[PDB]
Ligand binder design. Structure first.
Ligand SMILES: OC[C@H](Cc1ccoc1)Nc1ncnc2[nH]ccc12
Ligand SMILES: [Cl-]
Length: 167
């Protein structure tokens, strides 16, 4: 039993809700919130901009030190950093950004990072301003993640479309 509430159950392990991931994380304070990161951990827009703003820029300060020490992530890769006031940990995951010409096949690799964590609050990787098809992102999520994932979908018409089109 966990404190996630109001989710629709899609499979044994994947749950979905129309929600603002910032407000969800503040309420649940989950063990892991997933950020839709880029390789530079520059949290400017989309989910990343919103999560960073909610931390009063502490996420960005921590991220800049991480990059100065370790260099950029790989597309498809991840790192675990602090969750600040939102969660215990933030798993920064880099899905391919179609608006940069990156390979959509890397989306499965990106979702594989979720399997290192028993329970996660997450957005759909490569959706929104990353330019991929969200119906496709949900399919890859369901077919790749085996741990318990609670997906927050920001857009209401998209949430309804994702539910009604889910196989
Ligand atoms: O796939 C990630 C989606 C993309 C999208 C599609 C339509 O609008 C946004 N973004 C988000 N999902 C959940 N919580 C969020 N908080 C701020 C942004 C955000
Ligand atoms: Cl977005």
């Amino acid at each position: 039993v966990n404190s996630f509430s109001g989710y629709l159950k899609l499979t044994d392990n994947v749950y979905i809700k129309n929600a603002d991931i910032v407000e969800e994380a503040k309420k649940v304070k989950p063990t892991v919130v997933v950020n839709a990161a880029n390789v530079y951990l520059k949290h400017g827009g989309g989910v990343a901009g919103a999560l960073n703003k909610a931390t009063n820029n502490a996420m960005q300060v921590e991220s800049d030190d991480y990059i100065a020490t370790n260099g950029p992530l790989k597309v498809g890769g991840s790192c675990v950093l602090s969750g600040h006031n939102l969660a215990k940990h933030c798993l920064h995951v880099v899905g391919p950004n179609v608006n940069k010409g990156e390979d959509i096949q890397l989306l499965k690799s990106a979702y594989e990072n979720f399997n290192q964590h028993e329970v996660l609050l997450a957005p759909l990787l490569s959706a929104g301003i990353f330019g991929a098809d969200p119906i496709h992102s949900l399919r890859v999520c369901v077919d790749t993640v085996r741990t318990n994932v609670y997906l927050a979908v920001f857009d209401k018409n998209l949430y309804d479309k994702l539910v009604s089109s889910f196989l």
